Nucleic acid binder design. Structure first.
Ligand code: ADP
Ligand code: ADP
Ligand code: MG
Ligand code: ZN
Lengths: 49, 571, 619
DNA sequence: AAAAAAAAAAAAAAAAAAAAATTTTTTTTTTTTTTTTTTTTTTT
DNA sequence: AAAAAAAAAAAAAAAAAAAAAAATTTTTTTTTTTTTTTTTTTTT
């Protein structure tokens, strides 16, 4: 959530002088990804919760 | 209804443009902070626009908000230099706006409730003074229908609290973040805050735990004064109605107990909290205070109550006291410049009327008859107020500097007699009574009246009036008073001359030392009750006569007239 | 808590009062108000492109936040229709505002009705799935206390979308003195209520994916405008619903689409005319009424060569005959039905696709695509009430319409016999133990069978060469035989036509990338729909001369001598053939806009059957 | 000069008012599964 | 062409999810009425 609103702040300042209507700073989802090997669905014990 | 953005534009253009730039000079002075209060005049606004004036009369509070914010925004372009920051409050506001500029980010938008408010950051105040068209209405008649309406009232004061700091905008600081939140107060009470809505706190999920303090706050000069109907305003048989008035900013410390006032304000409500509804108290929020109608040689003395005839030397001595002998504090011991007169008389010579005229005349005056003001009425006592044992004053301490016109001194209570002896001798009133341990300060001058020894021995003049029936005297007086009934200087001009006369401060010359000592010893031989008190009497009367002449040096004419007056009184 | 004034609402109502004010303009919306007042309909349909051009900002505002904006619109509408007629405006407690136009970004499909479009008037095409019972909902309920001779009117606010409180939902039953209150149902006021379910079209939807659907709450004015299976475009307010009271909530907010209007997405009920077009049709009829059938027949189905008799016959179908329902309900049908039987690559399926694209309410049925219960109607239980509902089939959908039967030969005998009563009487009498009904499907059938052996053998008789019973070929009223003569001369004809149509392009619109009464006579080579649509309604009665001539020609056809030896009949001449003669005569007269079927149309009909039926088998 | 009436202030007690407060269970709905009938399709 | 076998359809019954439904007084505060005590002011 910190990353999400951080993205929101940087988003508004970069697009800052916006036109009419599109001024209420819309929410900025931050999805993810990686390059490490995925782990198997059988390896989700309690400890990786 | 209307649009208040349009109204604000109207008043902004008005304040910029109306007249020497009448309002412009005031605006620049307050911009530099050479004045802290401002006063709109509805006569000056009816000079051009009457609809706005009628609307102000009907919903004055809103337009007060409009005018004050309009001037607040007009401020900085009128500002031209760096003000010296005369107050720690100035330091705070400058620091606040400095850090707002520092972390401004001007494109960045901020919430509708994240901003330093006007009521905090104004540092000036704006009041009004209602139009001459607005008749001052009776304090009884200012009913619920006149709540919110702009209204002027004329009333006597009864008692006035002191200047204690009312809160305007409380300031709270946090335990973790460091921002500073505001609670703008409006009402008699506020529940403190304990949590900080600063966005750093909302991000951290920390305990607010903010602590109120007085440093960053905004207090104000606040008084609650009382007022009372005019006895002429009162209806046929009801007692005079009271009213509570609230005094703010540069309206504070104008009215004082006993002085007539005209207060211009709005009649706004407070929450009452046993019948249902939503009840509410009523206080009048003062917006202009003007004392009025009491506290704004030969022909002069004859002007003192023209409706009385004869007693010309009495009137001259009355004029003399009204000018007042020179106040002296040489070598610590006080020689007060008060003049004390008693009028012992046969039953009915208009001595009470003379006392009443002096009461109407003097800038401070208290006309007390025998028993209407006894004990605490003359002395000072204790009363519940911020509830507290407020010690307030009676007649003499109300007349602390003025003239107590005491009527029928002969039949006063013996405690009243003792107190009056104390105040004539030392201009204090010591008390060590049940719940009072004080020494009041009462620099009053006494005008006693009575009907036929301590009186003779403690005074500056006693006058025995015996209306020995003389046909021509009574004929002329009868013609005079009958003419008075037949036909039914101005007081303001008389009082103006007296007021200027009070402040010339003569100093006695050496040439009159031989004369005054010779006259003193000769008067003593002519007596042989006279003593050092009578010496001080002639000397004070000489100083006061020099004041009446307005010259700074006393002469032989003055002492001659003084001896003339005292000879007339004794005989 | 009555509001003294709001700048937003006042501004919006002023803007839309101006928008409705149409006198300085052409008077379009004023005319709409006047006609709807005359109709007693109480919804006015405002084009969003009109709103956008007159004030783009208001269009943006409304398409972003509907309900209060449309409250402003509808209050303006009430004021406006009161100025036109206060008496009528007083009649209805509310009037409504439908929408139309180019909802550019606001046109999605129920797969793509995301959570971005809440309180925004969304446009969405799709197929209905359900049709809940249209049941009343109480709005203003009146009560009578007989103990105290009292009357009350409890009032209800349509909070179908906002928060709703029990104090608002109380239905009173006792007075303050605990007396009994009797409801006054008639004096109360109600509005219909129906739920339906739009679905992403399977022709539009992704191929391999489950359906996605959206719920639609049609209150009054939109009761029966959408049945299951229909194509419908719904424009209206996607919103959220309130969960009923309870101290807990999951975040779930089951959402709906309170439709602002719904229109038939088929876009085939299209009689859109102008007075100039009416005059155009009138002159087209009257000037050359006698040649007009051949004009239409040659015109119809361009992009194909010859088959002029078949074009005439498909005109006879589309224009239709005239259904007859006599005094006692003996219903004699008035539809043509054509069986194309012919060699492959004879554009039979192309004619079928032509009538699919042109004729209104045309629908395709394949051999083993559709089958019986699919073709005709069905009876199935509800399982929510244990009650037998009826599921209208392909033919019942095509009632007063066209069905194009691809590969009619391949329908098994069960379905080929199931089509019997729809073929003759245009009804399907279905029944199971609970419910029975006679669904009405006054359909017309253009069916493209293919011959036995995969291609017609010239020497074999048509009855041998068609794998279809004389039983059915009776019910079919025309059977047209389409042979591929394979001669080079007619091959030159067809080939030049075909390659010209391969060379024809969108005129000017294209550059090289791939995807009026008369026509501008393009050398390489709408009003058809207009004229045939108006043509369908006329009932040209048969003249005495036409009836006697058609009767005698039928008697001649029945007599064996009329066919020479070496010819073989293609369909036996039952009395269905006489009725065919009458129906084709009526269709020709309807083409002429005659108002009477004359000997010209009669001899055209007899020419039609004589070419169609008797075939010259060669040795 | 002594007695007493009144005043303000302080305290006790009874009537009214103020305030505090989630959890468990039931029922509709959806979704599959299974039986048996009906229908359709392949065989001699 | 009709009989046998198989597949699909229709309808009833069951299992879990998740949204609805139901139950539900007692202790503390505090204002107001009443009485009481010490004092000052006034009267005999
Ligand atoms: N020259 C005069 N001018 C006005 N009023 C007079 C004059 N002479 C006598 N009187 C009357 O005498 C009356 C008694 O006066 P008052 O003030 O009662 O004297 P005291 O109270 O000393 O007996 C007043 O009502 C006043 O009207
Ligand atoms: N009468 C015709 N005129 C022009 N082109 C034809 C004609 N008959 C067939 N064709 C061509 O042959 C093709 C046959 O397609 P189609 O009609 O789908 O198969 P079938 O004719 O076997 O039903 C068409 O695409 C068309 O271009
Ligand atoms: Mg007197
Ligand atoms: Zn903080």
């Amino acid at each position: 959530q910190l990353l999400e609103e951080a993205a929101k702040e940087v988003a508004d300042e970069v697009t800052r002088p916006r036109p009419s209507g599109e001024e209420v700073l819309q929410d900025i989802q931050v999805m993810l990804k990686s390059d490490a090997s995925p782990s198997s669905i059988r390896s989700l014990k309690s400890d990786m919760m | 209804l209307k649009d208040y953005a349009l109204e604000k534009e109207k008043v902004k253009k008005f304040l910029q443009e109306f007249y020497q730039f009448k309002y412009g000079n005031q605006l620049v002075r307050l911009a530099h902070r050479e004045q802290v209060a401002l006063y709109v005049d509805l006569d000056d606004v009816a000079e051009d626009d009457p609809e706005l004036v009628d609307s102000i009369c009907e919903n004055a509070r809103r337009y007060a908000k409009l005018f004050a914010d309009a001037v607040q925004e007009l401020l900085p372009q009128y500002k031209e230099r760096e003000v010296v920051n005369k107050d720690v409050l100035d330091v705070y506001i400058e620091h606040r706006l400095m850090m707002e500029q520092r972390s401004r980010d001007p494109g960045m938008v901020r919430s509708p409730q994240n901003q330093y408010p006007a009521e905090l950051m104004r540092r000036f105040e704006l009041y009004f003074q209602g139009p001459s068209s607005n008749k001052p209405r009776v304090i009884r008649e200012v009913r619920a229908d006149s709540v919110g309406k702009l209204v002027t009232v004329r009333g006597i004061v009864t008692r006035v609290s002191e200047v204690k700091p009312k809160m305007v905008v409380a300031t709270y600081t946090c335990d973790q973040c460091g921002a500073e939140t505001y609670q703008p107060i409006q009402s008699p009470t506020f529940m403190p805050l304990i949590m900080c809505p600063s966005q750093e706190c909302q991000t951290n999920r920390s305990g607010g735990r903010l602590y109120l303090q007085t440093r960053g706050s905004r207090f104000i000069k606040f008084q609650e004064m009382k007022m009372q109907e005019h006895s002429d305003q009162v209806p046929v048989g009801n007692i005079p109605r009271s009213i509570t008035v609230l005094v703010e900013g540069e309206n504070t410390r104008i009215a004082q107990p006993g002085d007539h006032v005209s207060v211009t304000g709005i009649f706004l409500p407070i929450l009452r909290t046993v019948v249902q509804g939503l009840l509410s108290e009523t206080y009048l929020e003062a917006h202009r205070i003007v004392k009025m109608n009491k506290s704004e040689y030969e022909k002069l003395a004859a002007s003192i109550a023209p409706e009385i005839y004869g007693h010309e030397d009495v009137k001259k001595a009355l004029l003399l006291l009204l000018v007042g002998g020179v106040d002296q504090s040489p070598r610590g011991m006080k020689i007060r410049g008060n003049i004390n007169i008693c009028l012992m008389g046969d039953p009915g010579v208009a001595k009470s009327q003379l006392l009443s005229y002096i009461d109407r005349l003097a800038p401070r005056s208290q006309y007390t008859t025998g028993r209407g003001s006894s004990g605490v009425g003359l002395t000072a006592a204790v009363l519940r107020d911020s509830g507290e044992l407020t010690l307030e004053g009676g007649a003499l301490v109300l007349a602390d500097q003025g003239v107590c016109c005491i009527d029928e001194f002969d039949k006063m209570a013996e405690a009243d007699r003792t107190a009056i002896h104390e105040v004539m001798e030392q201009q204090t009133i010591s008390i060590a009574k049940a719940g009072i341990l004080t020494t009041l300060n009462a620099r009053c001058s006494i005008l006693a009246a009575a009907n036929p020894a301590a009186l003779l021995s403690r005074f500056d003049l006693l006058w025995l009036i015996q209306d020995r029936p003389d046909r021509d005297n009574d004929l002329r007086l009868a013609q005079h008073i009958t003419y008075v009934h037949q036909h039914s200087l101005d007081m303001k001009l008389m009082r103006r001359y007296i007021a200027m006369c009070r402040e010339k401060q003569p100093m006695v010359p050496e040439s009159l030392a031989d004369y005054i000592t010779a006259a003193y010893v000769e008067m003593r031989r002519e007596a042989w009750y006279t003593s050092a008190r009578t010496l001080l009497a002639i000397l004070r009367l000489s100083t006061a006569l020099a004041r009446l002449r307005m010259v700074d040096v006393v002469e032989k004419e003055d002492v001659n007239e003084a001896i003339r007056l005292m000879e007339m009184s004794k005989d | 808590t009555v509001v003294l004034d709001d700048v937003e609402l006042r501004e919006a109502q002023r803007d839309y009062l101006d928008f409705l004010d149409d006198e300085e303009d052409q008077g379009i919306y004023q005319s709409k108000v006047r006609e709807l007042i005359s109709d007693n309909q109480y919804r006015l349909i405002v084009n969003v492109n009109d709103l956008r051009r007159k004030n783009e900002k208001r269009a943006n505002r409304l398409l972003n936040n509907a309900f209060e904006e449309l409250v402003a619109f509808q209050r303006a509408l009430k004021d406006f229709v009161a100025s036109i007629d206060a008496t009528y405006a007083k009649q209805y407690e509310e009037f409504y505002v439908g929408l139309e136009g180019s909802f550019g970004s606001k046109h999605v499909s129920p797969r793509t009705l995301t959570s971005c479009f809440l309180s925004c008037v969304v446009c969405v095409e799709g197929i209905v799935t359900k049709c809940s019972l249209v049941r009343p909902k109480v709005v203003r309920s009146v009560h009578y206390c007989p103990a105290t001779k009292k009357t009350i009117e409890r009032r209800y606010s349509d909070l179908t979308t906002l928060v709703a409180f029990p104090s608002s939902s109380v239905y009173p039953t006792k007075d303050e003195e605990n007396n009994p209150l009797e409801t006054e149902y008639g004096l109360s006021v109600y509005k219909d209520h129906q739920t339906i379910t739009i679905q992403e079209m399977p022709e539009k939807a992704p191929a391999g994916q489950l359906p996605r659907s959206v719920d639609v709450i049609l209150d009054d004015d939109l009761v029966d405008k959408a049945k299951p299976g229909d194509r419908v475009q719904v424009v209206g307010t996607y919103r959220c619903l309130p969960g009923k009271k309870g101290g807990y909530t999951s975040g779930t907010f089951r959402t709906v689409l309170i439709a602002c209007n719904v229109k038939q997405m088929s876009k085939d009920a299209q009689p859109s005319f102008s007075a100039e077009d009416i005059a155009k049709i009138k002159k087209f009829s009257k000037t050359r009424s006698k040649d007009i059938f051949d004009q239409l027949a040659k015109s119809l189905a361009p992009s194909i060569h010859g088959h002029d008799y078949v074009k005439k016959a498909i005109l006879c179908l589309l224009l239709g005959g005239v259904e007859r329902d006599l005094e006692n309900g003996s219903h004699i049908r008035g539809d043509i039905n054509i069986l194309l039987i012919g060699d492959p690559s004879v554009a039979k399926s192309q004619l079928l696709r032509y009538v699919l694209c042109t004729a209104p309410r045309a629908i395709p049925t394949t051999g083993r695509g559709s089958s019986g219960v699919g073709l005709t109607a069905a009876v199935t239980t509800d399982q929510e009430t244990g009650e037998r509902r009826l599921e209208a089939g392909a033919m019942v959908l095509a009632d007063r319409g066209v069905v194009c039967i691809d590969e009619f030969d391949k329908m098994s005998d069960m379905d080929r016999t199931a089509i019997h009563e729809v073929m003759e009487q245009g009804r399907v009498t279905i029944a199971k133990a609970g419910i029975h009904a006679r669904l009405n499907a006054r359909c017309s059938v253009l069916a493209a069978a293919n011959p036995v052996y995969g291609r017609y053998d010239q020497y074999k008789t048509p009855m041998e060469n068609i794998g279809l019973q004389d039983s059915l070929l009776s019910r079919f009223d025309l059977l047209f035989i389409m042979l591929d003569q394979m001669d080079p001369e007619q091959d030159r004809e067809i080939s030049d036509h075909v390659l010209r149509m391969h060379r024809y392009r969108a005129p000017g619109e294209q550059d090289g990338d791939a995807m009026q009464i008369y026509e501008k006579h393009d050398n390489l080579l709408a009003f058809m729909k207009k004229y045939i649509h108006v043509a369908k309604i006329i009932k040209p009665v048969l003249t005495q001369e036409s009836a006697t001539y058609i009767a005698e020609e039928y008697s001649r056809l029945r007599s064996q001598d009329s066919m020479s030896s070496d010819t073989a009949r293609t369909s036996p001449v039952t009395a269905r053939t006489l009725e065919t003669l009458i129906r084709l005569a009526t269709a020709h007269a309807k083409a002429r806009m005659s108002k009477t079927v004359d000997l010209q149309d009669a001899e055209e009909a007899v020419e039609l059957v004589q070419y169609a039926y008797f075939k010259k088998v060669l040795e």
